[PDB]
Amino acid sequence: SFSGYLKLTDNVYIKNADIVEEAKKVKPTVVVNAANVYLKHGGGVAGALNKATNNAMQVESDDYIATNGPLKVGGSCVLSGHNLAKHCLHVVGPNVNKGEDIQLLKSAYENFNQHEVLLAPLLSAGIFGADPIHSLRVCVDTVRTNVYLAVFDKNLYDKLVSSFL
Numbered sequence: 552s553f554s555g556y557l558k559l560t561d562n563v564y565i566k567n568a569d570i571v572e573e574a575k576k577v578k579p580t581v582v583v584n585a586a587n588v589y590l591k592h593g594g595g596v597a598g599a600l601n602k603a604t605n606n607a608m609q610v611e612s613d614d615y616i617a618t619n620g621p622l623k624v625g626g627s628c629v630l631s632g633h634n635l636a637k638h639c640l641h642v643v644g645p646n647v648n649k650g651e652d653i654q655l656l657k658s659a660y661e662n663f664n665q666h667e668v669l670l671a672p673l674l675s676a677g678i679f680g681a682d683p684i685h686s687l688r689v690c691v692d693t694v695r696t697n698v699y700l701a702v703f704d705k706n707l708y709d710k711l712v713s714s715f716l
């Protein structure tokens with residue numbers, strides 16, 4: 552039911568879309584969140600997905616952290632997708648603005664391989680400070696499952712498509 556996507560590879564698709572609106576429309580099995588290790592969904596994609604759940608994602612996340620402790624950078628956890636998806640896969644890409652190792656981006660994308668189909672943002676892009684062109688390259692070279700990438704910014708989407716090798 553994903554519509555309007557440009558096919559980049561056998562398994563990677565891309566669209567200029569707000570991932571919240573895309574999730575509300577498709578109600579995919581899995582929506583990926585651009586999470587941090589504490590699951591504090593303050594801004595970027597995380598803040599937007601959490602706001603769309605009326606903070607239910609944050610309440611569930613705080614209980615998860617209270618029980619399990621923080622995630623690792625490069626790691627993930629599966630929680631409810633609330634009103635957006637069946638599940639939310641909270642994936643922690645390295646935050647270059649926190650001085651985290653960009654080399655952990657491949658480990659972060661490997662989490663996507665545990666799900667046959669996902670709606671996702673580019674990991675470590677936006678407020679996480681990594682080059683989105685590099686994130687897309689790591690995505691295509693790491694993810695083997697079917698990933699539908701939503702890129703909020705039109706200008707960035709055009710740059711990503713036009714520079715895709």
Ligand SMILES: CC(=O)Nc1ccc(Nc2ccccc2)cc1
Nearest residue numbers: 676677678680681682683704707
């Ligand atoms: C709104 C938005 O995400 N815009 C945006 C931000 C950064 C880049 N490019 C870039 C980042 C870090 C390092 C090298 C290039 C491209 C587009």
